[PDB]
Symmetry: C2
Subunit: 238 residues, 2 copies
């Protein structure tokens, strides 16, 4: 029917800052647990509330406090943020204390020393090379998204308005091209015949997760908010 939901999904904060994560448990569940997970590592139990009462606590830092409300939703208030706080934060709910836990999608928090380096990607689509097509009868489009920071992007391919996965090969993880700039590439391979149809449309779509409306930004340059950036091309006859 539905599962645990959380908000926000991605958030970027400056060191010394403050934010609040919220969790809505499955309807009828009254027990809510929070975990912290450094990317690629184990889940770390933080705290558990059942009928608003704290039942058990792990290594919840004193800078963090959690409260559960009448409707059983839970909020973690995180203050005086440190770089070390960059992690995934999962909430999970169960009907009662002692029962099976159902997991939320997680909130990814990234804490930076200076928000002034945050910047969205530029995205370029490259049509197939003549040599590739002549030699293999396949046609590979390259999408390059780069110049972005931090590394919170999601790249997808759309052909004639529909998302595709067949023939898609995306780099598993963006890499740094310089201190405050990432690069990520993807390829979509189709048949030469499919590419040679002028009426086929191709779009590489990137979603960048950045600053929110809320965040302060000094005059001068556009605020690097969450936004979509894409590049497109049509097929091309011989």
């Amino acid at each position: 029917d539905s599962g645990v939901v959380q908000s926000p999904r991605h958030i970027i904060k400056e060191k010394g800052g403050r934010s609040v994560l919220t969790c809505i448990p499955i309807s009828g569940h009254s027990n809510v647990v929070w975990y912290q997970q450094t990317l690629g590592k184990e889940l770390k139990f933080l705290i558990q509330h059942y009928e608003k009462v704290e039942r058990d606590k792990g290594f919840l830092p004193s800078r963090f406090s959690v409260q559960q409300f009448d409707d059983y939703h839970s909020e973690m208030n995180m203050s005086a943020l440190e770089l070390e706080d960059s992690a995934m934060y999962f909430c999970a709910s169960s009907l009662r204390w002692g029962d099976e836990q159902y997991f939320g999608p997680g909130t990814r928090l990234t804490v930076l020393e200076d928000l002034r380096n945050v910047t969205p990607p530029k995205v370029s689509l490259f049509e197939p090379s003549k040599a590739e097509i002549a030699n293999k009868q396949k046609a590979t489009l390259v999408c390059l998204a780069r110049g972005f920071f931090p590394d919170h992007v999601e790249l997808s391919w759309w052909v004639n308005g529909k998302e595709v996965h067949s023939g898609v090969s995306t780099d598993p993880q963006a890499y740094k091209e310089s201190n405050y700039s990432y690069s990520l590439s993807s390829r979509l391979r189709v048949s030469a015949t499919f590419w040679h149809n002028p009426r086929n449309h191709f779009r590489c779509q990137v979603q960048f997760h950045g600053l929110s409306e809320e965040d302060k930004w000094p005059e001068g340059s556009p605020k690097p908010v969450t936004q979509n950036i894409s590049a497109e091309a049509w097929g091309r006859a011989d």
Copy 2:
């Protein structure tokens, strides 16, 4: 409690098209065991559940994975025809019975690569504090850099006079990729200038790299990138 769920292996590197088996031992007395898959930085994906040896719930488990629970209630996921996209953390969790609170294992980090020849241990460098810092802040920060390694299978720790320390340590939460086949990670240890001003204080940045297995093949001509410990160290110093 007395113990928790354990898993094996903790890290493993496989080539595309290969096969491996991940194993989970539940908390003693628990007979319900579930597996989850998690791609780096994403949500947990429920794979499958066994209780008293019988499959109950199943999520989207690829046909290439098969899971079995055994007499002693431990569970094994046999993974075949591995794909790059199978690179993930795999958690198991156990509960007394189905429907009960589940307890998580530490996870197995599976990395699937196109070419094992890209696997490389880190170079580790320790930097003594700058004279400017000591003079102006009366603190002394040592920097440890561990870089040029692949894949992202490094753990960094600090040891002062033979004992692990945490006070004054700031380690990057995540290594970043320098390029498609190389990572970098840094850490700082800050101590007082007076503590650094002692020739007999010893400082060591210790890195553990999880690499290829004893069983993996490796061509002649360069050292095999096996699991190994790599460190850098310094003693404190008199006035200069």
